[PDB]
Amino acid sequence: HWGYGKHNGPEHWHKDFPIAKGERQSPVDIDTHTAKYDPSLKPLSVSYDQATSLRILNNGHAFNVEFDDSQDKAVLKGGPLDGTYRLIQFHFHWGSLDGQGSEHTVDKKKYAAELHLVHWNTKYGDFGKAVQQPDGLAVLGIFLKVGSAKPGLQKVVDVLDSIKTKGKSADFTNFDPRGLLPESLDYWTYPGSLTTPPLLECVTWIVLKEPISVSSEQVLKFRKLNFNGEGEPEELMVDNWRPAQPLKNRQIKASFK
Ligand SMILES: NS(=O)(=O)c1c(F)c(F)c(Sc2nc3ccccc3s2)c(F)c1F
Numbered sequence: 001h002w003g004y005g006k007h008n009g010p011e012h013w014h015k016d017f018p019i020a021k022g023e024r025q026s027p028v029d030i031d032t033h034t035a036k037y038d039p040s041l042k043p044l045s046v047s048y049d050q051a052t053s054l055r056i057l058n059n060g061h062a063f064n065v066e067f068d069d070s071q072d073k074a075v076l077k078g079g080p081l082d083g084t085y086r087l088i089q090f091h092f093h094w095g096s097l098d099g100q101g102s103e104h105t106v107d108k109k110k111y112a113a114e115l116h117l118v119h120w121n122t123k124y125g126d127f128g129k130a131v132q133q134p135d136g137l138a139v140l141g142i143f144l145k146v147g148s149a150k151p152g153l154q155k156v157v158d159v160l161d162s163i164k165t166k167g168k169s170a171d172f173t174n175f176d177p178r179g180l181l182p183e184s185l186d187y188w189t190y191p192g193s194l195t196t197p198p199l200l201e202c203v204t205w206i207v208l209k210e211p212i213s214v215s216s217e218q219v220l221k222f223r224k225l226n227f228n229g230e231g232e233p234e235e236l237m238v239d240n241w242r243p244a245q246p247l248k249n250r251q252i253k254a255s256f257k
């Protein structure tokens with residue numbers, strides 16, 4: 001029953017998932033002036049050379065590109081992180097218009113979209129167990145603005161017509177997610193949560209400073225997706241983002257400046 005519309009949208013989530021009003025909820029606004037530079041934070045390590053994508057899926061809330069996480073292939077490590085975390089999927093959140101769509105904001109700025117590359121802590125042996133742990137997940141967030149095309153995103157955009165409606169999937173092999181990374185790896189980092197139900201407070205958030213650009217035609221194709229299933233009255237998949245939640249005590253750290 002949860003979703004993004006008037007009657008089931010984020011402001012309604014706490015009824016089914018009371019952790020919605022918890023102490024480390026995401027996303028947040030990144031106040032770039034109150035974030036603490038920390039010279040002791042390590043460079044992020046993104047080792048994606050051996051990634052193996054398998055499938056793309058419309059789950060009724062976004063689309064996921066899934067990876068085979070059964071060995072140490074695509075991993076995140078270093079940065080603020082203690083273990084190594086394995087890539088399991090990526091997805092995006094986007095707007096009905098270019099002026100909105102991102103979940104994190106930067107001094108109140110909303111970007112057109114936000115890419116989430118979701119990884120899990122190897123010491124918990126799988127994603128299902130990792131989410132019940134406070135340091136179970138690491139999500140690398142990357143902001144999208146509209147301007148020039150991202151060539152590396154086009155294979156994703158071209159297959160979306162085949163997964164139009166809730167439930168649909170398609171084989172999605174040899175997709176290289178290094179094609180979605182900006183040039184710099186400068187980041188902010190803070191402790192928080194899944195930004196969809198079940199809203200578990202299990203995530204180390206790593207948000208890149210440098211957005212990637214995508215074309216208006218790329219983002220327009222995200223907006224032709226559907227929340228509904230093939231049976232049903234079309235609701236376009238747009239504005240599937242949660243807004244910024246209270247920071248409460250937490251401190252946001254910066255890798256830079
Ligand atoms: N916005 S987010 O990166 O915090 C996020 C995520 F990490 C995810 F891993 C997912 S999919 C997901 N599936 C399950 C299954 C069981 C328990 C928690 C989750 S989150 C998700 F939908 C999502 F929005």
Ligand SMILES: [Zn+2]
Pocket residue numbers: 091092093116195
């Ligand atoms: Zn997400």
